[PDB]
Structures are given as C-alpha cells and as structure tokens.
Amino acid sequence: RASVFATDHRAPTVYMPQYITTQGVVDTTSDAVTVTFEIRDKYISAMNNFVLSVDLPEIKGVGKMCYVPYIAYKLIRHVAVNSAADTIWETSGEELFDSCLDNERVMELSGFSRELNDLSTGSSPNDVIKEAACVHAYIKTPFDADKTFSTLKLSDSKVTVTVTLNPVACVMVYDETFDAAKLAKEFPYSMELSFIGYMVKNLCPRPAFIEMPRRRVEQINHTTAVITDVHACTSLSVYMKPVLSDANNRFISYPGFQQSEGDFVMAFVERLLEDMVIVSNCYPEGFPETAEIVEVPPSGVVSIQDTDVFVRIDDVPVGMRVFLHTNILVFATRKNSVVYNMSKKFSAITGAYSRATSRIRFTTAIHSVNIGDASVPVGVWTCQRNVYNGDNRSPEARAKDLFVADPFLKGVDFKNKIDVIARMDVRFGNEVLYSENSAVSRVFGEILGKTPGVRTLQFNFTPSTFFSPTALNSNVSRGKDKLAVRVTTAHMEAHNPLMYVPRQMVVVCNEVYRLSYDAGIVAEKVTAQ
Amino acid sequence: RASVFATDHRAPTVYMPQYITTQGVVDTTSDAVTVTFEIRDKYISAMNNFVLSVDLPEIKGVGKMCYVPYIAYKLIRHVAVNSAADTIWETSGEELFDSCLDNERVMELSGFSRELNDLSTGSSPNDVIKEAACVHAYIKTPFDADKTFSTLKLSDSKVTVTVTLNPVACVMVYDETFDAAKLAKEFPYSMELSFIGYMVKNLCPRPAFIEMPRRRVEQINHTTAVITDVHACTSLSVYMKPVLSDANNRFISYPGFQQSEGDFVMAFVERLLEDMVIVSNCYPEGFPETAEIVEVPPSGVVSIQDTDVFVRIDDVPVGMRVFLHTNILVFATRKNSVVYNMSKKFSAITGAYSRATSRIRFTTAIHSVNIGDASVPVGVWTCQRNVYNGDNRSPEARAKDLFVADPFLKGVDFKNKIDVIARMDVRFGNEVLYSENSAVSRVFGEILGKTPGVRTLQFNFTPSTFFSPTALNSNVSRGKDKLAVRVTTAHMEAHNPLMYVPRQMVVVCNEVYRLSYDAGIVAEKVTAQ
Amino acid sequence: RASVFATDHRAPTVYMPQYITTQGVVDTTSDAVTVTFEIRDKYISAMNNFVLSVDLPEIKGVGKMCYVPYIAYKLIRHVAVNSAADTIWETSGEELFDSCLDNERVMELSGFSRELNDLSTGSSPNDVIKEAACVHAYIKTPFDADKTFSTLKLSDSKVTVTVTLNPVACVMVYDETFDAAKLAKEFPYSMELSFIGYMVKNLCPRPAFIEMPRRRVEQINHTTAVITDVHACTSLSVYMKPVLSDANNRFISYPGFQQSEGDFVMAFVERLLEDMVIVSNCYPEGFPETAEIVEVPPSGVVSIQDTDVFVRIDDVPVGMRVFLHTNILVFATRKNSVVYNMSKKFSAITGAYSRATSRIRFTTAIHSVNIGDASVPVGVWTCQRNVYNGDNRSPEARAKDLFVADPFLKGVDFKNKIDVIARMDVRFGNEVLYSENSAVSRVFGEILGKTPGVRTLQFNFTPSTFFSPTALNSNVSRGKDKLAVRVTTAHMEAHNPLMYVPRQMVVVCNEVYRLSYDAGIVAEKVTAQ
Asked: For C88, which of B462, C81, C368, C403 could close a Cys bridge (C-beta 3.0–4.6 Å)?
C-alpha cells in the first residue's frame, strides 16, 4: 500500500526569486509604436511572470470620453521575446488577451473600473476628463505554465522583449467633440516591464517545448483560409472579427463600465427613446424630411403599418402633445420589400414628462431590441446598400454618437453572441480532418477551458512540461502539411443590417517549438516530430 | 537535491483526439421519452467529454412563458452508458446537474440568458414567444476526471448512451393562457450527442475504478431512509425536495432571468403590491367577500390589529381615495390562534399614482417578506388545512399566476436557504456512524467542494485514477451492509404555511465500481473490498 | 513512451474520515474573550479542515444595526493550535481572513447575506432587529494544503485550539440609538469547533514543514518596521491599516450588503443629497451658523466660488423655494488656502419633490465623489487640524451617522483602492533586498494569487508537502538576520482630509517551522537552515 498521509520530502534546488523592473525604450519612427525592454541582469539563471505596466496621462479638454475595459491588454498589438535577433516566443495582442480572460483579478489589473470606463465629460479646455492612472497587463507566457519548471533559462544571453502597440484610439471611446488626434499625437508611451528572475545554484538547462500561436487573417468577407507549413499543431482556433474602419467605427451608444449584453441593449434603447418620443407644442422640427413623426392618439396606440406601439406619457402640459418617431432607423436592400425598422421593435413605452428638465423620464419600455441591433454601426445604417435614408435621428442625437475601435472584438456584435458561422470544414492535406454543421467545437472549447466564444479544435490533452506535447503531425509523403479551413455564413434576414457589417476570418494555429540552451537560446520549429 | 527548474520529459502515448457527433433516436412509446445514441466508431480506442445538444423549437401563440435556467440539464431525468445491454455508468439528472453547477461557462451553455429565462408574452396566435435556440448539457462523467487517464476504453464494443427526459413542462414557467399541453404534444425531441474520441496506438486497457451515484427517494413526508447492499460508498448525501404536484405548482410570481434570493422576493413583493394598494373612487370591488379592504386615513397609517402600515401615495386625483388590502394572503390551522398575514409583513409603502396608466408606480416598500413566503404555492395558501379563505386577491392578480415544475429544487424554498432538517443520524448496520444536531455536514460539503446546499458525508479523500478510491466498507459478519438515515424536521411556527409544503427525503450514495476490459466492457460493483 | 491512458493504481493506506464537533469553553476574565476547544478523541491519528461555528443571538430593541460582511471571520482576533502548552500553529484573524477571501462559497458561509448585512431598524424595545443566525469560519491551516498528506498527526497528544475574539462591536454597524454596549455585555459566546479526523491504520508520522505568519504592527503613522530573528521566510507582506479608535469610527454612511465601490459612493451620495437640497417656504433653519445655504435661481445654476451646480427639482409647490447647501463638509489646514468642499463635488442635481413624504426623490446626480471621500470619518472632518467648522449638516442628518469598527480594513478607504504607499525598501541585514517606486509587488501578489490588495514579496515557488519549502535564508556571519521595511507615503493634496486619517503599518513575515512527531507534537522554528 502507498501512503497518502506521509511522504519523504525532497530538498529542492537552491534558488532565490527576485522582482526585476526595466524601463522601456520607445521607438515612434515606424507606423506602429514599439517599446523595447532589455533583460540586463546577469546574476539570474531563469525568468518568468512578465508584467507590462503602462502609465496613462491625465486627459484634459472638452468632449466626452471613456476607456474601453482592459486598457493594458487592448494597447498591445504584438509581444516578442528575442535572444540576439532570434525570436524565442511571440504572440499577438488578441491571443494574449484571450489567454488571460479567465483570471478576474489579473484582468482587473489591466484597468476595469467606473472611473476608467464610464463616459466622462469635459466642458472647458482645463476640465479633467480622466485622471492619470497606471494599468498592468500580465503577459502570460508558456514559461509560467508550471512555475519554476517552465521558466525561460538564461545563460549569458541578451534577452530582449519588444512590445508593438495599437493606436491609442483603439483603447478609447469618444464623441465628436473630443480631440482624440491631439492626445494621440502627444501621448507619452511611458511603460515598464516587470518579471520574476531566479538566482539558481547549479542550473543545467534541459531542452523544453513551448507552443507559439500563429495567426492568419483573411481578406474582408473571405470564408477560406490556408495555413501552410503545419507540422506540429496543438490546437486550431477559428473565429470572425468585425472590420470597424472609418465611418464604421461610429456607434449610437456604448454602455461604458457596465459590459453585460443587457447593459449594451439598455444604453442603445435609452439613446433611441431620447429621440423616438417627443413632447412639443407643434410638429417637431429639425428631423430629416424622410422622418415620419405622428401624433399619439388619445387611446395611446400608434399603428406603424401592422404593428402597434402603446405610448403613455404622464404629466404632459396642457398645450403640449406627444409625438412618436415611426422610422427612426430603417434598412432595406430593395424597394417594396420588408423594412428593418427600429421603431417597430417597441410595443409599449411609458414615462413621465419633467417640466424642470424639459425631457421625458422613461419608466418602462417593452421592446425586442437585441445586441445585434445595438452593434450595428451608423455607417451600415447609412451605407449605399440602404435604399432608404437610414438615419432619421435629429442632429443632437446624431451628435451624441460615439467612436469605438476596440481591437479584440469577435463576431459581429459587441458580446459575440450571434454566431455568423454555420458550417466549418477543416482539411489536412487532401483529406477532411473535421467537419461540423453547428458550433460543436465552440461548446468543446468552452468545456475544455479554451478561448471563450470561438471554435477550437484541441489536439493536445497531454500534461505540460513533464511530457512532450501531443500535436497534429504532418505526413509529407501524403502531402499532409497544410490546413485549409472553409466556413459558411449563417443565414440571416436580407433586410437585417447586421448581415452587411464587414467581417474578417481569423485562424489561429498553436505550433510546437523546441527550446534548446546548448548554444544560447534557440527556438526550433518542430518538424516531422 | 531534486530539481524544480529542469525535468527529463517523457514521450506520451501516440494518440489523436477527434470530435464526434451522433444523432439521437427518439422513443416516445413509454411514459418517459428516451433518446438513444449509438457509438458507431471502430477506429477510436478511448472516449470522454460527453455533451448533449438539444434543439429548442420556436414557441408561438398567446400567453406568457419563460424557460427555467439551465434548460439542457433540467430536461434530463436519467443518463445511462451501456455496453451490450450492460450498464457501464448511469446517473440521475439531478446528480449530473449538481456535479456541473460549479462551472459557470458550462452552465451558461445549458441556456441561461435574458432571451431564454425572462417572461415573454404572446398576444396573437402568430406571435413568437420564444425564438428557436440550441442548448448544451455537458454530461460530466468519471471518464473526464483525469483527462486521457480516466477515459472509457473501447475494444470492439457497442457502447450506447440512453437519455431519459423529464416532461417538457418541467423546463417551462407559464401562465394559465399559455397552451403548454399542445406544445408538449408537438415538441420535436431533436438532440445530438457529442464526445471526444481518441485514436490510440498500442493501447492496453487496465482495470479502473469509477463511482456511480445511487439515488433513493422516500415517500412523501417520510423522515427515514434505508439503503441496502452498501459495500463501498465514497460519499453519502441527504437533502429534502419539494413535491410540486398539481395545484402545488401554481405560484404567485417567478423572477425569470434574475435568480438571486432578493430577485425572488422582489418579484413576489411587486406582485403583492399590485393588489394590496388600490386607488379608486368608491370602495374597491371584485375581491372575495372575506377580503378586508380599508381606506387609508389622512395620517397615512393603517392599523392591522397591533401592526401599523404607513401608506403614502403621491398624485392621487382629487375625487379618488387610497385603499389598503389588510388580509391579502392569510393562513392558520386553528381558529382564534395567531394568523400568518402577508399584509402585516409591510411596514411602509410609498409610491406615485400614474394617470396615464391608471396604476401606482411604487418607489419604496419596507417589508419583512422572505424567500419562504415567496416560495409558498397557491395550493398551500388555499389548502383544506387553512381555516381561512387563504387567497383574497382579485381575479386579475390570480390570473397573473405562474406554473413552475423545476425538477431540481431542493429544500422547501426556491433558493434552498431555509433548512428543514434539524438533526441527522446515520447508522451503518446496528451502530451509529454519524450524528449531528446542526448542519455540520452541509458546511463540510461547502468547504470540500461537494454538492452545494446539501448535507454530505465524504469518505474518500484519496486522489483519483492513480489510487484506488477509499470508501466506507461493509463488514457482513457484524451486519454492516446497510445505511439507515433518520432526520428530524426543523421547528417552524405552526401558522407558517411553509411547514405544510409537501417534501420528499432524498439519499444519494456514491458507490465504487470496477471497470474491466478483459472481455468487453464490464462494470462490477465492488463487494466486500 | 510513458502511457497517458492507463496507469497501475496503488492501494492507499487504510483510513476512515469522520466529522468531529467539540464544544467551546468560554473565558471572559481577561481583556479579550477566549474560547478553548479540547481535541478529546484518542482513536483518530490525523486531523485537518477546522471549522468554527458561531451562534448569533436574536437582536431586539430600538435603533438601527447591521452586521459587517463575513461575521464569523471578523469575530476572530487570533487562533492558536497547541499541544501540551506548546504552539503547533497560530495566526491572526486578519491573516486567516486574507487567506480565505478567494473562496466565495466559504466566505458566504461566514455570514454574507441581505438579512444579516443590510441595515435593520427597531422602533420598540420588543422589535426584532436581527433574527438569530449561525455562521461558520473555515479555519484554513497548512494541514489542508495537500488533503491527507498535510494532515496534523496525533500520537496520544492533547491538542487544544484557542480562539481569541475581537469585541462584538467590531462585527456591527449601528447608529447612536442602538444599545451596542448592553448587547456586548449580554452576548453569549456559544461556539463549536468542527474538524475531520482520520482513523488511520499503521500510520508512521514523518517530519513536516509548515509556515506560520508573524505579524508586526508599527506605531501610528510610523513608516519603518524591523523584524528580528528572520531565518526562513517564504513571503513578506506589507500594507497599511486605518486606526479608528473613538470618534474616528463614526461615518456618514455604510452601504450594508452591497459592498462594491460604487455602492459605498452611492450610499454616501444619498446621505449627502438628503441634506444638501432643501425645499422650504422660508430660509432653512437648524443648520449651524457657518452653513452657507443659498436659494436656487430660476436658471437653476448655483455658483460656489468658480464652481457651478445645476439644480432642477420638479413639482415644487407654489409657495416653496429650493435651497442648496454650498458647504456641507469642508476641510482645510490653513486659512485662505484651497478648501476641500464636498458640495463642490456636484455638477448637476435633478429630482422631483414628493408632497406625500415631504421629501425629494432624486433621479440623477452628476458628481465627482470618490471612495476616499466616502471613507473619511466624521472625526477627521471635525478634527482640530481643520481650520473650518467641518460638519455643517443638520442635527437629523448627523443623527443618521453610523459607527464602524471593522477589524480587517486595509489602506485608508473602505475598498483599499487608494494606495498610500509610494516607495518601499526592504533591507535584509545591511544590504538592500528589494526596492520599488510603484506597486510592482502588489501586481505580483495579484498575479500569484496572494493576499489581495497588499504588497507581497514571494520567496517560495516550490510545491508544498512534497518538497521542503524554499525561503529567504539568514546568514548570521554577514549579519543577515533581520528585515527592515521602509515606506514613503504617497503624495496627497494638503487640503484632502484623507491625508489625516490615522494609519498603522503592518508587516507580515511567513516563517518556516519544522513539525516533528518523535516525542509528542513539537514545532521548531527553522533557524539557519
């Protein structure tokens, strides 16, 4: 019998950890800002637990602005760990963010708070919109997988960490008044890199295996991706990303710190209601000539074609009347067809009119507005595909619009709940590797603790750092060295504007690399093994 | 010294996982609907990570209806894994649900959202109450305990998975108008089973140990349970379940997607307030003749026996008066005794009357209503034990009632916070195995990560799949082969209606089985070992 | 190749766990109440999983009162496990609470609920403020680290557990009317200790290593701490604690069950708004003569120096006027200097006046009030250092104040979000061990899953119970046997009252002890090893 109450403890190798912080050297001469950190310590033999610290300057001026959640991660486009001009490990910002999303405390470190993420307003050039702050991004690496066992070994080697940054506008949500360009021009990229170094006595570095994510982004509205030179893949991930370019980054609302689906929908609905119901003495003016504003009858029921909206507003003054905007946002690709009308999404609206503020305090609104509706950019509403005018809102409501350029969005909606992929076929060489008609791989990714809300084919179930990893292996004789992924778009109503939001297919292939310390630090891509 | 920075990695077994999905064959000829899946793959040698996918059809018609949270799990009554008419592993739906409750992402896969769980209303026969949806239940098995190590081994064996389903009404909350019977009659039981198969090179299966939960449900209001043929029990669980039969499934309110105790209480209080305070020109009509409605005095204080209720309603029209229902729900088993009165649970009620909607917008209510009050079925309020009429609500408020048949409720309230067990004695053979006067075992179950909110006696603390499990073992010579559990009901006020809610005692015994692969797949109950 | 699908299971040592509950003996003769538990079982050979159960009596009388969250842990000042007048393991209450804070189920066991933590009011001497309750504190010990492997071995030894308690007022939040002293006098300290004992056959105890937290609290507003006799330290933690002795325990608001930063700020803002905006026929009376109350102009804009507050109140009666309190709370250390004015934190206030309740229902308030403002004690506002009166509130608003003595507060605000430490230098002997200019150690503590919100230097990354722990080791020849920690206060505005909240520096050093069972149970501090 093996005892489970007593063990003969082993003495571990003698070591002493130490926290080490290094200053970054900013290079702005290229298209993307880069910050370079040199590992200048020569008394340490191992290292892991990389942390990036970012100093956010105080923001002053006029306009409305908030930060996107998890500022520190959203600022990162690419991280590369190099040893004398040779890459040891590298990842995209999105893969890092996905790998860190599970840890709540760590993600909170990156900046997620009412002060940072709720919309703040400046009304004078000296008004402070956002106070200065420090945020931190935990750069999860395979070197942290098994604590000291997985650490990156250093043997008189110059290890360099290079971080490539997204534009500062990517981590910002702001209105038209806010001067985002000036702040981007004057942003000080003051950052520090921290890590745990280990002074280890009598360390003999053995070869190790690490996984490096290879990311392929297809052209806009392309549904096929080919990954070449695939020899040892531990997991394959497929998902779609929105393309929010100019005029497709403009949104009617943004919930700020409250990030649930209901919060997005409620912010969108509040913005819509601000412009849908009007209390005025005469016919409301200022709307586009295509807007169809009708007076609410004494019964309170307004009929829009064959759907009824029940409007009941309290405390309307004697002279005033209640009006309803019946086509506040419309979309269709052909004339005389069915029209996507945001006003028709409402069944009942109730509220009380306030004399002091000359506005309506809405108390209850029964509606069918969903996350997809709240995620449609203004440019899609007003695109050339629309046969109608599209945006019938007043100039003030349009002036309340916000610009969003969050770099790590997935799917077509902000919460990645509407799946635009119906079928997925994966081919290794000539043969079919996997085929599914539904999101089975997404469910399996959820169950196995992989990247949330994406389709993932997991090939490695072997424990790390004590076994070599199991991977989908190439067979060059049969030509099995390339992965081809084909996806079919999920069916949507042709009048739904969400169909026409541009999208890009992303394929992520995690590949096995062999880490050797015989002569410096060298990472070799595993082939035929 | 043993190194903690470098290890000599081992090459693992050569294997390749694959996601496999199979179609279900529905059998409706018996009392309980069954869906059978055949594992038709002969290339694979091992398998685990079972997932059940359920297609929910679009719901159309009139009435109000929502889904209960975690639809996919609530649909499951029983799961059995068989190999040529012999059971390998089987569980009840409730045990599966309890075993999966810890993983938030997995539970969200089963259907837990605003769209699914909040009450939706149809007003025309063609109105869509609920859109079609797909939900997934992760069938956690002992085969997933240690990833590939615990996988079920296949050796040219026909493994079949049979899922027995609860009635569709069990996963639905609806009013009297909704035609639940018609939808149950026409429910398409389209389901798929998914699992991860493993193509393993040179696999030699070895005997393994798995735990199978044996579930015993005692007769209604029985407090003693005897489990026979107990030879290797790893854990014993005891809890009470409500018996929500016909007319005991009718409830005044249901919170829907918001599932906290405060949400249940708030929904119940809103429903009560809608009928307790009345603004009317004359004495309110339509209530039963036993209802005691009194006018609110100018001081705003209404005295109910020796209890005062402070009612202040703003914006009451000049000619109208405010009325308070003082016995909206009452219960007592004896005349002239103390009466349980829901109206007396309120100390202060404030609100504003709305002319547009002809109703009251309540702003603040100070009350002592608890989860137990919100969990009392209408049938208990109106049962023959009540010496009073019981339900004094108006016909409309009664028409707002909802039918709930959630299969996995524990205790006597929806949130399982009121413990109805005071003492518990467990006897193994003639001798006392464990006796407690408080919920010590429930606290230990919480600490050890066992089923939440139940009393659990844990016998196995040994790591799985690398040691044989430790269990409470039988001694036939002394007669130690049967477990007898006796519980005493916690003291409650005799006028509390919650005391008379029918309940059933449940005892769950997790027993050790030996899995052998010498001749097919055979699971043998561990006896006298 | 090593198999990952099949293993040769080992038979574990024969054991049987059992839940054991013992009654506590209360000693009130000393300054701090102590409860002693005797481990009276001679059959068992091992133990772990200690749980303390506390019976809370029913609370009756007049006044307002709520419990602090996690009552059971906050009641504990110190726990000591002894074997014949020799300490085996001991911890402070704060360290235990910090070590348990990550387990939400376990913390919920300790009394975190709406019934316990929201403010309750008694209006008669017979009114029940709080019903009786039972709460449980899981006494996490190193004996639970690796289940049976780490258990405390018993060999015919008399093990006693002594729990030292904080004053009952520490776990309560109450107003001036509540008679806390009488209830503290009459509190029955009814407590039970539960643990899991193991009946182990043929157990030979082996020496084991455990870590004991050594806690040092410096004098008030001291920034240097010296820890002597440091020979094997696995982790060092540094943080600041507020000192709320008397009149510094009085606070304007407390949010109760809702414990987010936003909840604290919202409760504070509601309390302030109740006194800032007054609707009255004549000039408001009852305020101190230093209060500056001004009438709101028809434009609604009130100018406070160079700050403008937009006040718009609906439904004001014809004869009444709206007033704004322009200095509700003020603080400054010098005359003519910048004044910290809480009224200046508000930019816009909107609401509707209620004739039924003669009060304002505030609907929207735009403000810059933060957690630090909500955490300033009333005594700091009215301290002698303030050159102004400080508290200009009305007597009723002042009568709504609450007394808080939560023992486990960190930082200077209730949520420990404002860091009062700028620099930290740690010296081991004469040399600098670690030096940081920012909260790098706090970030690493968050990443490594250490005590939340504190600066932690981690020295042990070695797995527990299978290796001897790695620690910062002493070198007596070089004088390396003492840790000196120096911190510099973070810069704050001189007019900010939060600067003058008294604080105490806490240093926690986790030290290695050797547990030997050769002759009884003896824990020996690891010295020079």
From this structure: C81
| Distance in angstroms (rounded) separating the CA atoms of residues C170 and B55 | 54
The length of chain B, given as a count of residues: 529
| Rg, Å, chain C Cα set | 27
The DSSP 8-state label assigned to residue C475 in this structure reads: B
Smallest Cβ–Cβ distance between A17 and the set C148, C438, C461 belongs to C461
Structure tokens at C146: 């690796």
The region, left, alpha or beta by phi > 0 then psi within -120 to 50, assigned to residue B273 is alpha
Rounded distance, CA A251 to CA A497, Å?
Answer: 14
Q: Alpha-carbon distance B383 to C188, whole Å? A: 41
**Cross-chain residue pair B5–A461, CB shorter than 8 Å:** no
**Topology adopted by domain A206-244+408-529:** Jelly Rolls (2.60.120)
- Are C391 and C341 in contact, with CB atoms under 8 Å apart? no
CA dist C29 and C24 (Å) reads 15
Q: Which two tokens stand for residue A321?
A: 């009347």
Considering only CB atoms, which chain B residues are within 8 Å of C147?
461, 463
Residues of chain B with CATH 2.60.120.730: 207-242+410-529
Is C5 near chain B, with CB under 8 Å?
A: yes
Residues of chain C with CATH 2.60.120.730: 206-244+411-529
C-alpha dihedral over A414, A418, A422, A423, to 10 degrees? 50
The domain B11-205 having CATH identifier 3.40.50.300: the answer here is no
* In contact, A523 and A514? CB cutoff 8 Å: yes
* Residue B296 burial (CB count, 10 A): 22
Ranges assigned E (strand) in B245-320: 250-251, 277-280, 293-295, 301-304, 307-314
Q: With an 8 Å Cβ cutoff, are C467 and A147 in contact?
A: no
- The third-level CATH classification (topology) of the domain covering C206-244+411-529 is Jelly Rolls (2.60.120)
- From chain A residues 14-43, the ones with a CB under 8 A of any chain C CB are 14-19, 21
Which experimental technique did the depositors report for determining this structure? cryo-EM
Amino acid, res. C462: T
CA distance B509 to A44: 54
Contacts of C472 in chain A (CB under 8 A): 16
CB contact under 8 Å between A5 and C15, yes or no, is yes
Judge: C467–A11 Cβ closer than 8 Å, yes or no.
Answer: yes
Copy the structure tokens of residue B508. Answer: 């769950």
Where does chain C hold its CATH 2.70.9.10 domain(s)? 10-205
Task: Tell me the sheet residues that pair with A458.
Answer: A235
C-alpha distance from residue C462 to each of A49, A466, B10, C232 (Å): 15, 16, 22, 14
- Output the CATH code of domain C10-205: 2.70.9.10
Q: Residues spanned by CATH 2.60.120.730 within chain A?
A: 206-244+408-529
